[model samples]
Target: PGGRGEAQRRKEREELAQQYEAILRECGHGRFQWTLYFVLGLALMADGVEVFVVGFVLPSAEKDMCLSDSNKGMLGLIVYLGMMVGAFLWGGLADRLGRRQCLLISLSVNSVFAFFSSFVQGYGTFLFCRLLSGVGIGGSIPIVFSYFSEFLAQEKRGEHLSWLCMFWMIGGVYAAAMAWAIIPHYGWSFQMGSAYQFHSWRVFVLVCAFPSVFAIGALTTQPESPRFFLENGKHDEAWMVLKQVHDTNMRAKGHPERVFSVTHIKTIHQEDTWYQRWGVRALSLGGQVWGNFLSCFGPEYRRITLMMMGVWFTMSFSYYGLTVWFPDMIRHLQAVDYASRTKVFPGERVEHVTFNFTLENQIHRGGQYFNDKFIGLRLKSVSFEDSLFEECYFEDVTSSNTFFRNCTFINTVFYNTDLFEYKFVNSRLINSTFLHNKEGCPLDVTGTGEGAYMVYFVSFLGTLAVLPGNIVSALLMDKIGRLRMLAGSSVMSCVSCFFLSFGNSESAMIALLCLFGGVSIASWNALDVLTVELYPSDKRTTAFGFLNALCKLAAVLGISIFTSFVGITKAAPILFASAALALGSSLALKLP
Candidate 1:
């Protein structure tokens, strides 16, 4: 307890921390980390679904729950509020309770609450259920990375975490794909509790609960964060975890003989016995939770902590604000485009409808009042110089380089058709309707007006777009470093969001949405990696919780801004998001 002994002991503790890092470095990144990525990735994906499923289910939920517009906003509002509270509560307890323990508890709570969420018939009841489940979702978000970063060797950590970020987009697509497959079928409905028919949308909600269910099961056998043990004075347990880690990793890489070098962990803090420490812990447990909170502002930690605050808040606010409104915007654009489209044809019968016939270079010119539906007619470079088609249905046809010149469309409908690159040259139109067509992208709203499926497909496409951008970040993550990756990605994200403001077509909006999602994920992935290196083990989970809670507040405010004001000025909502993203990414420049 003398000055020399105290100084030397503090040095030993710092040395021990460095050695632990070295031990993980030797453990290598292979089979074990790969296995854990999927396990952790699935849980992270569930968090994505938790945020996104609200919008996916909203239209159906509105009808089922008889929700008013103001009431509708509360579904999203309540979830973020729940997460804000939970992040604060669970994060503090996670540092004290053990990372695995809190993760297990939170994920289990999330699934149980989420499972029950699909059943409630009334509006307020459903909101209450989602609010509680959201707390569960929020609780797990921060710690998953805390647990993940410890297993990764330093060199591979950035790239690997970037891989995990892909799962969030995977989660988005999975939920959308499931909704598209399930929600269109009316037969899935069942009468439950004498109140309402449990419909396909309810089925959609029920399915989302399974990812956490599986992730939690896999989590049961996984090791707790070894660094946490080192900081918390569980030295023996820490050694055992790292020892096994190195042994498995070396053996998996076909070098079982190369055993770990760190034989023991000697630190300033050591536990004499659990029984004796219990009494001491009980007394200390009464101390303030704010003790750790104040550590964030300590002069040495002050710079990065504040930098992280702005970074976390803006990214969360901007990303959620953009995602939450994307589906509705697509829906709106679809309606407007469908309304303005020119109709084709006259009512007089020209009845013979052709099916699957490839009509090439054939010109069936003037006085053709083709009242027949055009399905599977491959018009390749065919010239219809003066085709007069009245009341003609153009459906399910692929026409490339084909010309329809000077044709007056009286009143017509287009469905299940993608006429490829054809010229409607000087074609006049009075009225028209387009339905259920891959009329644009390969993944254009697979199903629309029935109509929840339309929104789901758009979400699916947007998430699908995130993959390549994430992959791009992963490739250069370690090469360029985390801060640069984030700054560049967020800057690109800002660019994408800016363009989204001027986009008017469903096709244009869809393109920018995917672009925005693609670029912004790098920021998410980069920000996640930065959180790991900047904090000490003892306070890392607490820091994550605090940052997470701050972000949730931003998310709630962003949602309120978008929902309350998007109607007044659509471009304003998107521009505001771009501004926040720009500011947040710029703040990343100060960190080490």
Candidate 2:
């Protein structure tokens, strides 16, 4: 046996030849690559459409059930909670159960619950279905991402992952179209003729469910991952599958011999005892998950965590608070003086008032002003116009708090960190600040007289202050290094928080909160990029799944805790602000 070295080498050569032939055969098959790509695209489309469907559904439900603002927040929060659990649970299960199995299961489960959601009879039922559906939705993304990343070559991974996410935007479009098309015609309830039975909204949910079945069907055609098979110690099976792939591809190209196997391949194994094996399996299956959970608390993990936490909290608060309340705010302002005007302008007064308010030619020509000294301030139609004045003045005076942070906006920087900076719009600041400041002194602005304008100013400033830091972080991230971007963003977030903690003035607090939020978002962007870059290809999906789950959990905690504080006094905002600063600074120390 020792003397036959030449035979061993010859056997290796033959095996290598077979591998080469197999590969050539696969490559030659026409359209196989394109077919795989098409299937992937379809799967992505399904995922995107389902994820945001609940956001659209929320408005109708809110109106039908007469949900309070906090209740709406809770509903949204619970969906994220479900998503967090789903991501981790599904990812681990997929590796154990096989990718295709998990994909099919998740899609089917998600579809069923999502469709069932439309028929929910009460708020409790609706939330339950959404929570159930969200688990499936959450699990689908990481699995899909893992699938896509593994299928592509290493150099192309980032490109594919980035492009794949565009489908999420498409989902938003589908949700909007669904809302407009279905909700209006069917009303809120399911009706057969005049007899209303169930909710028709369920029809749309059922429609969303159908596409997931298509995704499952696509999975039927997919081969189990070659790497996964190899890792599981099924070398012959893996080789045969690889051969089949090559043979199928080569048949179309007419270069049948080009695909062949590598010669004399050897398996690589990590030697371990029974206990060690179990430990490795547990570490592989569970340790990484817990490691990621712990990572969020480490100095290295802090910037990313805080930045993500801030963006989620602020974005959730502002986006929901403004958007959900917009119609009411507008209606309230519009409706306030209309009843008074009708009562005051009886009979002849109607004609006089109409002439004064609607006859713009006469008023513009100075007749109304000449007749009535208080016409501009007291005019009924003008009350609506004055509300506009209120909005504008609030925006103008608070523009600095609203103005962009100094953080430059570069795509790389944006990718790398959570802070941004932009140049100030002077005119907007002057007008907004002047109007808001006039209504309440800089220090005390909490009463009914100041509450509306105060909230408006505070919210606007909070939004605006974050803008500049975001821009700066976006611009400088790559040039300065991703670590620096993370460090800087964290530092800024913490600094902003510290400033917010001591600020007594409504204007000052607004400015600080905005600044803090901006910096935090920028740093988060940095951490996201770094995490993607640091891990190996195989572990990336697991890492991603954990990150998504943990980050969302952090968001839920941050919102719940901060919301409770807001009910007490000014101390809550101050505490939140200071915490951001401390965490950001501490995390900055651990960056590469």
Candidate 3:
């Protein structure tokens, strides 16, 4: 009886494989497939909302939480760590239990934690919640990709998966748009209690949690993948799911009673002792977990595995290094623009002006070419061009990058003022008593000018520009192939980063940012598609889990290194990122 049971189970497994393949060929694309695609796509969007919102939240949270530079870096790092662990654990759970069950639980967990995070008062508590929320987010990432991929037909799989990747960019645009709309107006602080305060940043975080709730509601109405049921020895349940797929497809074509014919049917039962059924299954599950991990490093898959790991490592490093510091970089650029604008003369056609203003009064006028004037004025950032100043008294007047072209400073009394970059070309400085330090060095004038809405609006535009590249990549993914597209976009990203490092003008910088944003995002989309297609279905989720973990690990390292380098010079981090991306592009050429 024991020998017959073993033989019977083997025969049943052979028949099951044929039945499964038949179902795959017979099931047609219809409303069910499209609905499932979008439902899983929402999970990806929710993941994006949680991941990218931190960049916007950091500026305000830093002040309220009293976070230091290292604290800020750690805040970014902790979530990735939680995600890495969660991806590994929940990825295994999805394979063992079922994709639908795992997704439902993970989505619920993420939503609850994220919603609670908005109400936390202390930094430690907030940080803990973010880490926990990341665990749920990490689990959902690989599961959604795997779950969605299982339902797609092989011929249409690449195109459909590419479409799924677009949701990630959409989520990023949503986060950026929300930050732009809410942060400026709702950036008010109100005292809640002796130990807590309420701010707009918290409200923004709360708003981000709503999508996860919606995803949970949507997933509840969807069924588990029929493939998962077949793999787990639930033949009846698997057949019922296939029947629904067949009926949905046939009904859409006005043939509601069409039947999918299959000749083979077999029943296989577990032939284990009571102890073997309970205790041995537990041991087998543990072994399968480790087996799934080691399979990636086997001789057949080692090359692809290592190559993709390197690609993801450098991609994450460069991508996050730029994105995480984008807002702060824009602030610096705005200051430079503001300083340059101050040099523009207000009230056009003002050729000459004379004033006997005291040192206590601040003079803000620029480009007033006074000629043959004897006056005492306290000039703050005033430029003189083709003017003659005879017997003028300038007190406590500081100027930076201010030019004095063809001006005469005869008998001018200068006190406590910096004349750096204030060239007096073809001008006389007769008896001008300019103040100097004990070491005979002039003082330098430096100020961080204010920011404008236009600057913020431009940065938001760069964020929005990233979406079109994803669309382009999605359309071209099949024609050009993943490796070629990834390599091409990565090279473009590297070139864009190199130019961005030295960009001086605001227009040039914004243009380079758009280029870099588009190409880098497109490169990621290409890599996402390849990661799914590179592995077989049984081990696909595990591979994606490992890929996500390694990529995020790279992001943490890159952001940490970038934070330190940014303090040295903005160009330093950008140059470092460019080099890393160049290396990634070169490495991608070796991938099959």
Candidate 4:
């Protein structure tokens, strides 16, 4: 009988939470959210820029810093490594301190480090700065979602998060365009205290840092997460934050008479200790991490966990592998095309004074429609690339040291001469005699100067292709179930990767890239949705953290594999990725 007051207080606290949920629902989308989107959107964009900036800068940095092949490979790892460590560190601190505090601090930390890295002459110092920057950069990412999700209701969270992911594509486009415009500008450089001369790429690095700086102002102007305040029993502070949201929106969307009038809220108390509060320093989670690994791997749960791990590893592997190195791939192809020039002096040409036109020593990547002429006609020490043949004939020409890429042969004939060193890629030998007289390769190319502009342009356009896919995920993710969406998009990615394996004109490859990004990213978005939906809250973080580590590990391995000559110059990665996606798509179907 004396415990009646205790029951009343417990009932009132429950009522307070239920009312707070309703209050949060009514606050809804407004100028406050619009501002939050803009500010946090900048944060995501900046992150995309910072993560990829290392990839772009390393082109010049590789040479300028006298870095070896191994050095270049490791350079790529440092950022992702720093980011992984920092993600664990700052993700914890955001809840303990404040989302805004952690986020803004990270933004500034990364920006400062990036700016300083641009000026460093030594490789070690630049590496140090980038490690710090990546740490700073990685911290900002988890916090933005944590903070942004706090502001919205449950129904809108999916749509809002979908839109939030689009900002990453925007940042990628910005960075690609910036690198395209700024890095190739050929001017605006100076000496830095006789230590080193700042180049265009350095300027590119410096410019990428500024978005985070711009984000700092908008971040500071906004309030902390109301959820965080309410969690800590700061009811009045939470009320003020919510009212600011309501008041601002009331001015814009509501009638002038309306205002949030909630005066008091009850406390929600749970046992909070130092370990739970500040966390056991950064990455301390890993010490006892193995102790708890078997927690989620118990009998029935193991099947789902393994499936998710495989899917995540495959997705991140292919996506990061291709996205990060696509520019280099395109540029390498273009460079090879440029280097295949077989032109010689006009006087040196073997003319048709002789019967059957026995051309020698002068290799010609002849234009379209040459009657009684050979396309990609190379002889002696000559080599040709990407020749087209139509209504053309070699008749009796001797050739050697020549190859063809993406060439089409129609109603063409070759001579009786021996086909020495002939190599064909995406070239049809249909309706044409492969009389022993053909040609093949001795391959080569310079660094990145030839197609640098077009390379960056293709990358910029690729992001735009991926951008629209997110809109699809935003709209239909709830309408269609996660497993159906996941399997379809994942399988479609495999389909695109198959087509991407076939060679064609540059424009055709670009189209294939669009298809790949469109579906591949949709696959990723589906995974994001499925991740939260599949597991209970008790097992969710474990599932997420486990998958996340696997994903990052796969990406590092993916990038490391590309550092070699095999992955970049060949199509093996695409074929392997297609296999992985095929496996993953099948797994999604079996998932309950």
Model number with the top TM-score: 1
Candidate 3 collision pairs: none
Clashing pairs in 1: 343-431, 343-432, 344-409, 344-410, 345-390, 345-391, 345-410, 346-390, 346-391
Number of the top lDDT candidate: 1
In candidate 2, how many Å is residue 555 off?
2.7
Candidate 1 CA-lDDT value: 0.69
Candidate 1 residues lying further than 4 Å off, grouped into runs, are 1-13, 188-196, 254-288, 335-449, 476-478, 481-483, 573-586
Indicate the residue-level lDDT of 20 in model 3.
54
Q: Compared with the true structure, what per-residue lDDT tens digits does model 4 show for residues 1-592?
A: 6579867865876665566567777776777787789889889888888866766545555434444555766677888788777676665466466778888889989889988988776778988999999989877655776677667766676666666667776788788878777655555444354745456666778888878888876678888877667666666677767767877777777663444433222222221287765576434544444435566687647788888887676567446634565555566576577567446442322456334334543444544433454344534444444455566665555543335556666787667443432356555666876665423321111124335666666677776666776566445555766447766656655665666577456777777666666556545656655665565333444455456556767776767676655545457767787777766556767767
* Tens digit of per-residue lDDT, candidate 2, span 87-109: 88887666555666676778777
Off by over 4 Å in 2: 1-47, 65-73, 187-200, 240-256, 262-533, 536-539, 561-592
lDDT over C-alpha atoms for residue 369 of model 3? 40
Q: Write one digit per residue (lDDT tens) for candidate 1, span 1-592.
A: 6979978976886787787677777677667788888888889888878877866565664445343566766776788889998898788878888888888988999999889888766667787889889888888777888888777767777677777767877877787778777777655545454744456767779998888898888889888988778766787787777677667677668575535333443322344599889888766653545777776688758988888887775567446635666766776765566445433332224356446654343454565654555555554444554555556666554443334677665676655554433446566667755466655432211123244556667667667766786567556555775446766756655675666666677777777767666656656667766787777767788898898788778767767777776767767756666666665644757666
Clashing pairs in 4: 402-440, 418-436, 419-436, 419-437, 419-438, 421-439, 421-440, 422-439, 422-440, 423-440
Candidate 3 global CA lDDT score: 0.67
Model 3, span 497-564: residue lDDT tens: 56656666677766766666665665666676677777766677888888888877776665667566
Question: Candidate 4 regions off by >4 Å?
Answer: 1-20, 189-196, 255-259, 262-307, 342-448, 464-483, 503-505, 530-546, 564-592
For model 3, give the 10-residue run with minimal summed lDDT: 263-272
lDDT of 4 at 351: 51
